[PDB]
Amino acid sequence: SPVQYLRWGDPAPIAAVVFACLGLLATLFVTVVFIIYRDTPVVKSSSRELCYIILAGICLGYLCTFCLIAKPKQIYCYLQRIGIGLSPAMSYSALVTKTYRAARILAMSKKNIFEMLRIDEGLRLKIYKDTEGYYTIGIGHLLTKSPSLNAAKSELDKAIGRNTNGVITKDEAEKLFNQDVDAAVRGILRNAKLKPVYDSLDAVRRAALINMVFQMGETGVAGFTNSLRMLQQKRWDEAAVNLAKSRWYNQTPNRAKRVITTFRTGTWDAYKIMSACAQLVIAFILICIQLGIIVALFIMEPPDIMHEVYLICNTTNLGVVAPLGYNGLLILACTFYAFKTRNVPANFNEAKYIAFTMYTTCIIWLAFVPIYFGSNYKIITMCFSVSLSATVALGCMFVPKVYIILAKPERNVR
Numbered sequence: 097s098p099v100q101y102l103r104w105g106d107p108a109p110i111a112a113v114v115f116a117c118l119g120l121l122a123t124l125f126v127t128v129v130f131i132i133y134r135d136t137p138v139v140k141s142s143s144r145e146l147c148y149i150i151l152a153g154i155c156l157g158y159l160c161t162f163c164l165i166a167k168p169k170q171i172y173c174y175l176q177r178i179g180i181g182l183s184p185a186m187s188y189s190a191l192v193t194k195t196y197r198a199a200r201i202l203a204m205s206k207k208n209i210f211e212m213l214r215i216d217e218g219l220r221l222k223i224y225k226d227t228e229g230y231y232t233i234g235i236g237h238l239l240t241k242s243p244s245l246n247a248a249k250s251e252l253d254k255a256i257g258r259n260t261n262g263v264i265t266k267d268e269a270e271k272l273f274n275q276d277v278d279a280a281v282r283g284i285l286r287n288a289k290l291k292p293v294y295d296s297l298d299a300v301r302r303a304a305l306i307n308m309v310f311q312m313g314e315t316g317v318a319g320f321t322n323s324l325r326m327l328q329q330k331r332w333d334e335a336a337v338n339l340a341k342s343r344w345y346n347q348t349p350n351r352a353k354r355v356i357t358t359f360r361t362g363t364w365d366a367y368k369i370m371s372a373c374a375q376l377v378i379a380f381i382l383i384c385i386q387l388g389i390i391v392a393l394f395i396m397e398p399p400d401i402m403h404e405v406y407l408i409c410n411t412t413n414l415g416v417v418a419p420l421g422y423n424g425l426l427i428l429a430c431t432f433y434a435f436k437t438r439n440v441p442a443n444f445n446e447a448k449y450i451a452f453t454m455y456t457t458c459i460i461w462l463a464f465v466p467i468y469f470g471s472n473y474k475i476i477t478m479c480f481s482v483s484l485s486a487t488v489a490l491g492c493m494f495v496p497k498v499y500i501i502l503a504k505p506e507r508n509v510r
């Protein structure tokens with residue numbers, strides 16, 4: 097009984113139970129909120145089905161306390177090794193499926209910009225020089241400012257990952273082009289005249305503004321003071337009429353006509369250019385792998401009470417480390433794709449919170465490796481570790497969304 101330990105001078109069991117109960121309450125509250133407001137754009141724009149999996153893992157993580165702090169029965173040794181190993185696998189397999197799709201969506205997003213500027217600006221598959229005289233390759237990608245051709249080939253090989261001999265491919269020029277876009281977007285957000293327009297435009301019209309920046313530079317695009325303000329006010333037809341009188345349109349009319357048309361329609365018509373049930377199946381597969389790991393250790397090392405509110409079992413290091421390693425790979429893969437997509441603004445900046453969640457999860461799980469093994473109170477540390485990790489996933493990811501649902505119903509709009 098945790099209450100009796102509290103009376104005897106040990107508040108740790110009663111604390112871990114309160115942590116778990118409050119956590120189940122919150123997880124129940126967040127779940128019902130998402131069910132009720134499932135049709136709203138803050139819940140329907142994401143994977144509602146994967147969130148239920150993520151919430152189940154959080155809930156199940158809080159339930160582990162009731163198998164770590166329980167009465168001595170053999171099934172609770174089975175439920176310990178299930179919950180502690182599977183509850184993270186449930187939350188992070190669905191999360192890695194979610195983040196990986198955002199990375200594929202982000203990569204396919206950058207391909208359109210590349211096909212756009214490939215047609216407008218051009219592309220060389222072997223090393224050349226710009227009008228300054230510095231070595232270049234692809235769509236105007238700078239390699240080195242050194243007069244040595246071998247230096248250009250050296251920095252090119254490091255940039256691609258193979259011995260290119262000064263010759264690349266279309267996909268390897270797309271890779272280098274993605275660096276030049278991020279650079280140009282950084283200058284835009286550092287430019288006070290261009291920043292408010294870029295924030296207002298959709299993804300297609302941001303490509304057209306990046307196109308212009310790639311042609312005239314930041315200071316040059318800043319000259320279109322009136323036309324920029326019309327685009328910010330979403331006055332497309334007027335912005336094209338004004339841009340069609342520019343000196344930019346009369347010097348390069350073929351290119352400018354395509355960029356201007358894209359500003360009007362917000363489509364790619366002027367140029368030549370991941371399922372949902374699959375996410376459930378993939379998330380289900382990644383969870384069965386962890387279940388297989390657990391079941392195999394049930395056979396190699398059957399659960400058994402070692403021998404008291406602390407239920408101590410016979411779980412050996414391999415029974416702890418093997419699911420811990422797989423869970424760590426899920427966390428690392430999550431952190432990788434979440435970091436890669438950390439600036440994706442879709443879904444009310446859903447990706448900004450997911451990235452911050454995985455940063456904390458890494459520090460928590462890495463910190464509790466020396467903490468746990470160097471501890472003589474492993475059951476208590478295991479209780480708080482799971483609950484803490486579960487609270488971070490529930491706090492950083494779902495609380496910002498339940499907030500907008502209940503506190504800001506006016507911002508809940510597509």
Ligand SMILES: COc1cc(/N=N/c2ccccn2)ccc1NC(=O)c1ccccc1Cl
Binds near residue numbers: 183461
């Ligand atoms: C923070 O540590 C854990 C958290 C766990 N669930 N978190 C959850 C559960 C659900 C949702 C989100 N998050 C499970 C095992 C954990 N730890 C271990 O199994 C472990 C054992 C030995 C050494 C180190 C470690 Cl890190």
Ligand SMILES: CCCCCCCC/C=C\CCCCCCCC(=O)O
Binds near residue numbers: 099110114118
């Ligand atoms: C906003 C809602 C409040 C959220 C926190 C709620 C706090 C309630 C905490 C649990 C009660 C105190 C801890 C239980 C120990 C009781 C001791 C005993 O009964 O012998």
Ligand SMILES: CCCCCCCC/C=C\CCCCCCCC(=O)O
Binds near residue numbers: 120124127131148
């Ligand atoms: C009652 C046992 C402990 C559970 C208490 C917490 C309740 C919430 C549990 C997990 C939520 C996961 C998803 C639940 C079903 C989603 C419904 C749906 O698919 O629309």
Ligand SMILES: CCCCCCCC/C=C\CCCCCCCC(=O)O
Binds near residue numbers: 097098114167
């Ligand atoms: C308001 C949030 C919840 C308030 C605290 C609820 C917890 C009450 C404390 C007593 C334990 C209740 C059941 C836990 C059983 C522990 C298993 C065991 O006794 O070995």
Ligand SMILES: CCCCCCCC/C=C\CCCCCCCC(=O)O
Binds near residue numbers: 182186380391394395
């Ligand atoms: C998305 C999956 C959600 C599952 C939540 C509940 C987890 C239950 C999973 C199966 C437990 C079966 C464990 C094996 C039982 C003993 C068999 C044996 O090893 O001899």
Ligand SMILES: CCCCCCCC/C=C\CCCCCCCC(=O)O
Binds near residue numbers: 469
């Ligand atoms: C950033 C996420 C962290 C990834 C999971 C955390 C660590 C997973 C890696 C393997 C841990 C090494 C286990 C070594 C066990 C030591 C045996 C002992 O001390 O008794």
